[PDB]
């Protein structure tokens, strides 16, 4: 069936109809087809897919956050890769480009003029501003007014010109369209080369997309975190931060994830890169970065389970939400550790424990053992007990274990670890310190206790059989070693579960092993 598509501005609308005419020549072998919808900005495209007007449009990782929020609810289906088709990359580098012999450094950006790709875009706004927000002079909110005072002049695509006059000093009206000379990667670079701004926050491939001469490229320098400057060609050694690649988004329900990928995998072969002389999906004579990014070299399937907040990951989602609220972080006071329960019996045991812990432990509920793991990732949960197999699944996501369920009774149980593999308490990177501390405090209050539970609470005993922990557990040993999923499962067991996961694959494992 016909897969509608959203286009921004006239230049992209002309590339859309060309995306239509060219395709219908070799189409349709089975069914796929493309359509064209007119929209003023990307914000209009996200709102359109939610109203069923469109079906899919490519968004920047930083603009994905706005697409999955209510009521838009849009989940990415196909993500484009950068580099080559041989060795695909699911993450591009965000970097700050400046002129040579400028004098300005990363720490000294105040007063200087800026060129941003687009308000809310990874390389253009989220990463560059992300590090300056906590250094910005109050008030921090609105974040836009803070930036309008930090930089003297600036061009922020998609920004409110009426509410913020300084944010559109370089590009009046702050257009979000290709109609605006200063828009996107190549648009922010033409804002630097034109001497309008002293700095342009873009991608590492932006320098090569605009300039071809290595002699012309030496006229520019690259800013680095440690307040230094290195050759542009050294993007890997000197950059700001790594961010997820641009992906096409569609509705979570009724978005036709398969009918869109069937089109894109067939479109990259007919009108892709190094395949046709008539039409190119990543190149157009009417404009740059139309529909897709010129720096892209194809597409890749976004797993089923993987949602918007899982595609960006904890590290990045939290950073965006903190950037919009103006939150700037250790006091080592800790926060209640959110335990994840699975069954009805687990939550009941958890609830009775939450009250007994004086609020130190809280309870979050999940449907499946795999679903609790997902919540620990995005932040909805903090820790849960997992068996050897699942620890491998969780580890491949980004959760490192900190406790092990010992079963052998000894004088010093917590002090000495046990190999086995045994049940491990996986947690998130940041909440590893407190989980290590809080659960150790309960051990002295609800651990090895006389059989008087009838009156008091007992942490290891379950009303039925193995609820939050295994009943035959004596104590929770602390892993003094910075143990990961690889450092805890030895070496032979690691390869064991890996190959077994080859045939029997879960929806989570294929998600955590995607990027």
């Amino acid at each position: 069936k016909t897969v509608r598509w959203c286009a921004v501005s006239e230049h992209e609308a002309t590339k859309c109809q060309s995306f239509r005419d060219h395709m219908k020549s070799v189409i349709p072998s089975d069914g796929p087809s493309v359509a064209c919808v007119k929209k003023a900005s990307y914000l209009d495209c996200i709102r359109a897919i939610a109203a069923n007007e469109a079906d899919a449009v490519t968004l920047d990782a930083g603009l994905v956050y706005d697409a999955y929020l209510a009521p838009n609810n849009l989940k990415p289906v196909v993500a484009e890769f950068y580099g080559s088709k041989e060795d695909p990359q699911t993450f591009y580098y965000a970097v700050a480009v400046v002129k040579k012999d400028s004098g300005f450094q990363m720490n000294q950006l105040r007063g200087k003029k800026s060129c941003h790709t687009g308000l809310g875009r990874s390389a253009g706004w989220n990463i560059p501003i992300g590090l300056l927000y906590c250094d910005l002079p109050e008030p921090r909110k609105p974040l836009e007014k803070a930036v309008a005072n930090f930089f003297s002049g600036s061009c922020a695509p998609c920004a409110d010109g009426t509410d913020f006059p300084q944010l559109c000093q370089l590009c009046p009206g702050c257009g979000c369209s290709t109609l605006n000379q200063y828009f996107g990667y190549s648009g922010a670079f033409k804002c630097l080369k034109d001497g309008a701004g002293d700095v342009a926050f873009v991608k590492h491939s932006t320098i090569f997309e605009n300039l071809a001469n290595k002699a012309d490229r030496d006229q520019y320098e690259l800013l680095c975190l440690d307040n230094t400057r290195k050759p542009v060609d050294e993007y890997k050694d000197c950059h700001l931060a790594q961010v997820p690649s641009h992906t096409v988004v569609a509705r979570s329900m009724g978005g036709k994830e398969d009918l869109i990928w069937e089109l894109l995998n067939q479109a990259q072969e007919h009108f892709g890169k190094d395949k046709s002389k008539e039409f190119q999906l990543f190149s157009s004579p009417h404009g740059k970065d139309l529909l897709f990014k010129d720096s892209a070299h194809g597409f890749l399937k976004v797993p089923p389970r993987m949602d918007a907040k899982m595609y960006l990951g904890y590290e990045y989602v939290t950073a965006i939400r903190n950037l919009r609220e103006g939150t700037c972080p250790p006091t080592d006071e800790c926060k209640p550790v959110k335990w994840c329960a699975l069954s009805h019996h687990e939550r009941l045991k958890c609830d009775e424990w939450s009250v007994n812990s004086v609020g130190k432990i809280e309870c979050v509920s999940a449907e499946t053992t795999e679903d609790c793991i997902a919540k620990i990732m995005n932040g909805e949960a903090d820790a849960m007990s997992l068996d050897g197999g699942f620890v491998y699944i969780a580890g491949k996501c980004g959760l490192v274990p900190v406790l092990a369920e010992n079963y052998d009774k000894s004088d010093n149980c917590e002090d000495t670890p046990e190999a086995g593999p045994n049940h491990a308490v996986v947690t998130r990177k940041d909440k590893e310190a407190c989980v290590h501390k809080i659960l150790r405090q309960q051990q002295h209050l609800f651990g090895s206790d006389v059989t008087d539970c009838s009156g008091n609470f007992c942490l290891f005993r379950s009303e039925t059989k193995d609820l939050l922990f295994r009943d035959d557990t004596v104590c929770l040993a602390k892993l003094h070693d910075r143990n990961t999923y690889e450092k805890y499962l030895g070496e032979e067991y690691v390869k064991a579960v890996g190959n077994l996961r080859k045939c029997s694959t879960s929806s989570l494992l294929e998600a955590c092993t995607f990027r």
């Binding site: 009521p71 909110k141 509410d163 609830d351 909805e380």
Partner: protein, 638 residues
């Protein structure tokens, strides 16, 4: 256009140019010197405020007139004398100038026992039985009504209230004070329903009305009574060395009270500024206008803060361009001295019109009493809003911010019956707040005629600055509550409240088990509530703040939070304070525990049948409040 910080600054500037003292003194002029509710001078200040509101060019200005029944001292002055065993004897002790409204009005005679403050705990420690005898107490331990209520429970004959010199550093020992003993909010003869000619005022009597006489007497009068009494009072209670425990078997006191009830015309003056995004939703700001004596501290300051806040906000809108998302109502209540009467009539009266339209109440009464510390009692749903304001406003004397105690949330005390905010939260289910630039020790002349402007300005040199700091705190509560799409109500605050409840009830898990009862359901009830708010929190995090529709569905749910804690089962008329956490009676969470404490002593004071029900209704009530908060009915499995 205008963000928070731009509003904070525009407010501060307006405050700097505003002169409060001048207004507080103008309200203490000879034309407003006596404010007794329903007086010609009470109405005088009523018209003033009305015309003042109209002058501020507010979007709408209206007035409600109720015909409630108060009580007064007639031509037959009351008197307290000591008599002999056969009949009248000894000497005349005092001719009270002040009285206690809603007293039984009768003549009683009997032994006189000192119950100290009159707390239910004070009576239990008394070595002398209070049954069949007149008791004398010291005010401020608990409301006047509670002292009488606790005494009547232990079968007292009458009650005498005085002001010792320790708690009250007043030179003039002949000074008398006023108060009411109604254990109720608003008029006591239209319990649970509005006082309007509409109802024809059918015969109805509040259960909060005492069946025992209550009279106030000066310090000197009490000392005269102690001279006829023996038994040194315990050092436990910081009191005068005059204090005497009981009377001699030869002579006992004879109290005679003959107060007569009077029907008056009370006036409630309002002023409303319409919001632009949501006109129907509104926060309410009120202040007592009536006063037994001059009332500079009791009502003078508050009514002044109301006039100015209505002024400052009208200016910010008309001139500055401040755009309010939700309406703001300013109310000047009357009959306050008789128990938030004016306000409570309005609540009982337009309950249907404010069901879920009114999201918060800010009370200005007694906001300035001292200068030492900053006190605030309110609904948890405002704790965060308060905390954020404490660390935003600077103390009027010390340059430091109001946020100095991190664990201040845990030190907050429940709202009492005498507070005008009580009715709003416990009855209407509208989050209420009541802050104070209080002093470690309560204001001396609070009920005395002594509460003049001279006395206030003298005990508080920098009155104007403190009044401004006050107006500022309330001013930000308004800016925060109506400013932006998000409602600054923190439904999450309650988790601590429920955790506290369950933890205290878990202590008695031994008795629970002994009875055919399990405490597992309450553990879940609390958990389900926490997960409910968490999901709500995330639902806010995963939403587009700019989408009018998705926020309404989220802010609407948040507003109920308070409502859902009002126990549905009890009749609002007989038990108006339905809120489980802050209301009154058996239904309230405290009552459930209070009753279970009696089970530990194995005595017959504990009612098992009652407890089983107290428990069953409470657990569901917590449980149902949780099921609702989530978002939908079909989705919640458990």
């Amino acid at each position: 256009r205008l963000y928070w910080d731009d509003l904070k600054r525009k407010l501060s500037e307006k405050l700097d140019s505003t002169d409060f003292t001048s207004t507080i003194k103008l309200l203490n002029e000879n034309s407003y010197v006596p404010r007794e509710a329903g007086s010609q001078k009470d109405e005088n200040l009523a018209l003033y405020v009305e015309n003042q509101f109209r002058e501020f060019k507010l979007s709408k200005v209206w007035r409600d007139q109720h015909f409630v029944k108060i009580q007064v001292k007639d031509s037959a002055q009351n008197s307290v004398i000591i008599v002999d065993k056969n009949g009248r004897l000894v000497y005349l002790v005092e001719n009270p100038g002040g009285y206690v409204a809603y007293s039984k009005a009768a003549t009683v005679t009997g032994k006189l026992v000192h119950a100290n403050f009159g707390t239910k705990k004070d009576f239990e420690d008394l070595y002398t039985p209070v049954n069949g005898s007149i008791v004398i107490v010291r005010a401020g331990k608990i409301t006047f009504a509670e002292k009488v209520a606790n005494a009547e429970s232990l079968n007292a004959i009458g009650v005498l209230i005085y002001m010792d010199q320790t708690k009250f550093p007043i030179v003039n020992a002949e000074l008398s004070f006023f108060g009411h003993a109604h254990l109720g909010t608003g008029d006591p003869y239209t319990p649970g329903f509005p006082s309007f000619n509409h109802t024809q005022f059918p015969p109805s009597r509040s259960s909060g009305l005492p069946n025992i006489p209550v009279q106030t007497i000066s310090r000197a009068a009490a000392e005269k009574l102690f001279g006829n009494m023996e038994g040194d009072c315990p050092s436990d209670w910081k009191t005068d060395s005059t204090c005497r425990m009981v009377t001699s078997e030869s002579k006992n006191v004879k109290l005679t009270v003959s107060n007569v009830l009077k029907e008056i015309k009370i006036l409630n003056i309002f002023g409303v500024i319409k919001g632009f995004v949501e006109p129907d939703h509104y926060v309410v700001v009120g202040a007592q206008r009536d006063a037994w004596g001059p009332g500079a501290a009791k009502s003078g300051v508050g009514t002044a803060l109301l006039l100015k806040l209505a002024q400052m906000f009208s200016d910010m809108v008309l001139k500055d361009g401040f755009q309010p998302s939700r309406s703001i109502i300013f109310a000047s209540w009357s009959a306050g001295d008789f128990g938030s009467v004016g306000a409570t009539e309005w609540l009982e009266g337009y309950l249907s019109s404010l069901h879920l339209k009114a999201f918060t109440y800010i009370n200005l009464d007694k906001a300035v009493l001292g200068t030492s510390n900053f006190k605030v009692s309110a609904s948890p749903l405002l704790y965060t809003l308060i905390e954020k304001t404490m660390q935003n406003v600077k103390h009027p004397v010390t340059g430091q911010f109001l946020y100095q105690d991190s664990n201040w949330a845990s030190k907050v005390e429940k709202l009492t019956l005498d507070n005008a905010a009580f009715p709003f939260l416990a009855y209407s289910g509208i989050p209420a707040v009541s802050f104070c630039f209080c002093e470690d020790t309560d204001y001396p002349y609070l009920g005395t005629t002594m509460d003049t402007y001279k006395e206030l300005i003298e005990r508080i040199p920098e009155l104007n600055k403190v009044a401004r700091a006050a107006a500022e705190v309330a001013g930000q509560f308004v800016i925060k509550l109506t400013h932006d799409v998000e409602l600054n109500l923190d439904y999450e605050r309650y988790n601590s409240q429920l955790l506290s409840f369950v933890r205290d009830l878990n202590q008695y898990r031994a008795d629970i088990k002994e009875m055919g009862l399990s405490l597992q359901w309450l553990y879940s009830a609390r958990g389900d509530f926490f997960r409910a708010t968490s999901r709500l929190t995330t639902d806010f995090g995963n939403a587009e703040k700019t989408d009018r529709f998705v926020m309404k569905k989220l802010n609407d749910r948040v507003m109920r939070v308070e409502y859902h804690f009002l126990s549905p089962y009890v009749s609002p008329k007989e038990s108006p304070f339905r809120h489980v956490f802050w209301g009154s009676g058996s239904h309230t969470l405290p009552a459930l525990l209070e009753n279970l404490k009696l089970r530990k002593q194995n005595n017959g004071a504990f009612n098992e049948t009652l407890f089983r029900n107290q428990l069953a209704l409470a657990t569901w009530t917590i449980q149902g409040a949780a099921n609702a908060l989530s978002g939908d009915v079909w989705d919640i499995d458990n």
